[PDB]
Amino acid sequence: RAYNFSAGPAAVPLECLERAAAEMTNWRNSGMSVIEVSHRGKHWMEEQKEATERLRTLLQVPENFNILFVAGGASLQFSAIPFNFIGEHKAVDYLCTGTWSKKAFDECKRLAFPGVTVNSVAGNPPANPVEVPARDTWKLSEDAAYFYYCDNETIQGIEFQQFPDVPAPLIIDMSSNFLSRPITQWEKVGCIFACAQKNFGLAGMSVVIIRKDMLERPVKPFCPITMDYRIQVKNNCMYNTPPTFAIYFANHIFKWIEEKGGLAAMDALNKEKAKKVYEAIDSNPNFVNRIKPEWRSRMNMPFFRPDGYENKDLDADAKFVNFCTQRKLLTLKGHVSVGGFRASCYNACPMEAVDALVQAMKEW
Amino acid sequence: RAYNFSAGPAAVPLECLERAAAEMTNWRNSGMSVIEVSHRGKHWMEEQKEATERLRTLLQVPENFNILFVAGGASLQFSAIPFNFIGEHKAVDYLCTGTWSKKAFDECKRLAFPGVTVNSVAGNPPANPVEVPARDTWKLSEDAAYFYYCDNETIQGIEFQQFPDVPAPLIIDMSSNFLSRPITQWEKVGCIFACAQKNFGLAGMSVVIIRKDMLERPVKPFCPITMDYRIQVKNNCMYNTPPTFAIYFANHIFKWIEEKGGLAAMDALNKEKAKKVYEAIDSNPNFVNRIKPEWRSRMNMPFFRPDGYENKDLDADAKFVNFCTQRKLLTLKGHVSVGGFRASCYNACPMEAVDALVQAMKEWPGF
């Protein structure tokens, strides 16, 4: 077992892999793999109900929110969100703090729903952002259907300590920090979503959590029927065949998070993990992270050579990632757009892996 | 292991399940599960490349076709088809032989692309069709962008033996018979698609095979960017994160199919199994199937109590279903729309399972 710092898909608890291995040919004493079972059958309908409730209880999701498991990554939800939540409103607001919030903004722009202003709150971010632009600089729209933002930017390593204070309901991309800490301010939230492959298992599935009053809004025309979240809610997320393995495996990870003492415990461990990684970049002269303490991500810790933000060198970066690969510290190569290095440490990343990376960097 | 006749998701080769479990914590000596591997890394890009090539080999997909692995089941592709392939044409043709083709037709009608006639070629199908309507009764549209149809209707058990002959390019839902036999006459084909959960593994993923000049057509407005097949092709199905475990597992099944002699061998084994099931239906006064022999599915074999097509009785159905369930013959309950019984027997359905089903049907004391 290597120490895996992949951004996505990412490390998973070893216990969950072992349970899946051991259940693979015969699950729930059914004489079948979870892969082979009808989704209209008793066994699967139990598993999906269980998974939904486990998530309801882990997050303390209020009674006035629906919880959905749906096929497709975060990128598909970028399209679905404006189809579902613009309603009759004449404007939408996107705070683009980095690449992922910018892509979601670009998808809403490109779709070009008639009469709807697609508004970038702080404009496009710079190539290498240091912070979230000041609250007093934010351009908000009069008739905003929602305020979209990304709670944790993976490539930049920018994370909100708390939810923004704005008049419109928040729609929040939590792909890279979902179930990494509790969520407290539910009254502000219209929708929260996350692809599964960062903090709860397989790619190709996302969780979407929606406040019930948001689905009373009319769906825009030409929405694919399965991306209409009202139809999903109505049919128990089984209008068609759901991504059964992904929901099964996510449920095992939900159980594992519970065993570790809920989401508060995850937040503490993740903070302890991030503390050791950021200190090892800061104190060492070979590595640099320009992100400021207020906005530093507990999940994704990017860093470059001293002039690596401005001067891209694929050969210079290559030697350090090989140095890490050679000692079983895998997938520390940064995202291609920025290059450099990135330690992604989600819930399943152990402290043993963090200490090993610290020791490796300190010996560079 | 039970004898599993589920229509979808469906039985998988035990070897593939065993192979997946054995390398679950360490895939090809990488130090990590296939589940934990980056899609941008070297290991994953090889696996997906290999999976694509292997499928190309199995089917002998000609080089004027792209092969896609995409997130989402068949129902999402019902939406994506018209977005991608109407182009500037003023009509689309749908032949509705059963429930799934009708569903595909209804989604295109629902989406309501301005200025496009959504035409049902042979009308809406009856409650219990016994055949595909005769070719000479089909009413095709003048400027049709494509001719859409379902090669195997899972609930009705109606399967085409060969592709239809029509002017427009074919768009074919092969969800329930994909890789159950060879495909020829690629010149007739605009697009073929199949969700994975009948004949190549995990639900949540579909294969889409597209003739390259079909993607020269302009996409309709409001297409979600991940559902624009040009965008998928342009980014090697890695515009965003692909459903990696589904593709990996699909590839394991592709290898298993090659090990068993290829698609022509699958066709022979599936015909053997189907013939036994149909002879158990036909030769027994307690069971009936109405589908004409030329249209009988190899993959899905509905059958009923003697009067079960038009006279529904779920209690009488429940007696034989439970008779089967108490012998570990599982999910012989037919789709809720029709009641009665259905044996679904895809590639991985063991001959032993069919033998156990035939024995149950022979020993049933009767209705």
Please give the domain boundaries of chain A with CATH numbers for all domains: 14-260 (3.40.640.10), 261-364 (3.90.1150.10)
Q: Which two tokens stand for residue B330?
A: 């599982």
Does the CB of B275 have a partner CB in chain A at under 8 Å? no
Does the CB of A128 have a partner CB in chain B at under 8 Å? no
Give the C-alpha separation, B190 to B89, whole Å: 14
List b or e across A94-117, with b for residues whose CB sees 16 or more CB atoms inside 10 angstroms.
Answer: bbbbbbbbbbbbbbbbebebeebe
Does the CB of A257 have a partner CB in chain B at under 8 Å? no
Q: Which of B25, B35, B116, B195 should one mutate to test binding to chain A, selecting the residue with the greatest count of A CBs within 10 A?
A: B35
Burial class (CB in 10 A: 0-12, 13-18, 19+), B365: exposed
Does the CB of A113 have a partner CB in chain B at under 8 Å? yes
**Three-state SS at A329:** strand
Polymer length of chain B: 367
Give the C-alpha separation, B254 to B271, whole Å: 20
Polymer length of chain A: 364
Q: Which of A3, A27, A35 should one mutate to test binding to chain B, selecting the residue with the greatest count of B CBs within 10 A?
A: A35
Give the C-alpha separation, B21 to B19, whole Å: 6
Method of elucidation: X-ray
| C-alpha to C-alpha distances, A198 to A202, A205, A359, B26, nearest whole angstrom | 8, 11, 25, 19
Give the C-alpha separation, A335 to A337, whole Å: 6
- Region of A9 (left: φ > 0; alpha: ψ -120 to 50; beta: rest) is beta
Selection from A152, A136, A75, A145 nearest residue A115 by Cα? A145
Compute the Cα dihedral for A176, A178, A180, A186 and give only its sign. Answer: positive
Asked if A355 contacts A280 with a C-beta cutoff of 8 angstroms, the reply is no
Burial class (CB in 10 A: 0-12, 13-18, 19+), A283: exposed
Smallest CA–CA distance, residue B212 to chain A, in Å, is 24
Q: Which residue of A has its CA nearest to B41?
A: A331
Give the C-alpha separation, A334 to A154, whole Å: 10
Does the CB of A140 have a partner CB in chain B at under 8 Å? no
Q: For strand A189-195 and strand A205-211, is the pairing parallel, antiparallel, or unpaired?
A: antiparallel
Asked if B272 contacts B351 with a C-beta cutoff of 8 angstroms, the reply is yes
Nearest to B36 among A10, A20, A39 (CB): A10
Q: Which of B39, B241, B346 should one mutate to test binding to chain A, selecting the residue with the greatest count of A CBs within 10 A?
A: B241
ω into A9 cis (within 30 of 0): yes
Does the CB of B203 have a partner CB in chain A at under 8 Å? yes
Catalytic-role residue among A27, A44, A100, A295: A100
Does the CB of B24 have a partner CB in chain A at under 8 Å? yes
This structure's resolution (Å) is: 2.1
**Adjacent-strand bridge partners of A304:** A288
Q: Which two tokens stand for residue A60?
A: 């303390």
Does the CB of A322 have a partner CB in chain B at under 8 Å? no
Q: Which two tokens stand for residue A57?
A: 């209880």
Q: Which residue of B has its CA nearest to A223?
A: B111
| Chain B contact set for A227 (CB, 8 A) | 76, 79, 224
- Region of A60 (left: φ > 0; alpha: ψ -120 to 50; beta: rest) is left
Asked if A206 contacts A196 with a C-beta cutoff of 8 angstroms, the reply is yes
Compute the Cα dihedral for A252, A257, A263, A267 and give only its sign. Answer: negative
| Chain B contact set for A32 (CB, 8 A) | 1-2, 4, 11, 330
Selection from A118, A62, A82, A72 nearest residue A217 by Cα? A82
Catalytic-role residue among A198, A228, A273, A333: A198
Contact check, Cβ <8 Å, A37/B6:
yes
Give the C-alpha separation, A9 to B44, whole Å: 10
Selection from B106, B117, B119, B47 nearest residue B75 by Cα? B106
Q: Round to the nearest angstrom and report the end-to-end CA distance of chain A.
A: 23
Which are the contacts of A279, defined by CB distance < 8 A and separation ≥ 6? none
Contact check, Cβ <8 Å, A241/B330:
no
Selection from A192, A98, A194, A99 nearest residue A147 by Cα? A192
Question: Which segments of B308-364 are extended strands (E)?
Answer: 329-330, 341-344
